[PDB]
């Protein structure tokens, strides 16, 4: 049925702050990418995930802000 020409699996980029505001369209990925640099392993994961419950909430915003998208 050649859905390739019509709909393939398509990526969708979203950038959410604490309050679930979108910044994907305000800055592109590439210029953003130079700033990032990874930092320490699992100690870092624990330290930052000390408040990881918020991510569960963030989806309810992010979905709510990207589902329409």
């Amino acid at each position: 049925l050649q859905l390739n020409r019509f709909l393939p699996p398509t990526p969708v980029r979203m950038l959410l702050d604490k309050n679930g505001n979108n910044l994907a369209a305000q800055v592109e990925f590439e210029t953003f990418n130079r700033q990032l640099n990874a930092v320490n392993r699992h100690t870092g994961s624990k330290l930052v995930n000390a408040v990881q419950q918020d991510v569960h909430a963030i989806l309810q915003l992010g979905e709510a802000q990207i589902e329409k998208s």
Partner: protein
């Protein structure tokens, strides 16, 4: 560190000392979780032996912490 006599009596066997120190060193090499004693350019393994001699690290303690975080 140079000798390991002080660590023998802390973990009486001299081979279970090896495996327990290896456990702690593996925890401290890629499993993050920095040593509880300062280092002097020492490798992670020597720091593990050093803390074992200090008595604040033993197989029981490692198992307790592993179980505690496994409950998480």
């Amino acid at each position: 560190r140079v000798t390991v006599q002080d660590a023998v009596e802390k973990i009486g066997n001299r081979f279970d000392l090896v495996l327990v120190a290896a456990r702690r060193a593996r925890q401290m090499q890629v499993g993050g979780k920095d040593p509880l004693v300062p280092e002097e350019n020492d490798k992670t393994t020597v720091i593990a032996l050093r803390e074992i001699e200090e008595g604040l690290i033993n197989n029981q303690i490692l198992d307790v912490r592993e179980r505690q975080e496994q409950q998480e």
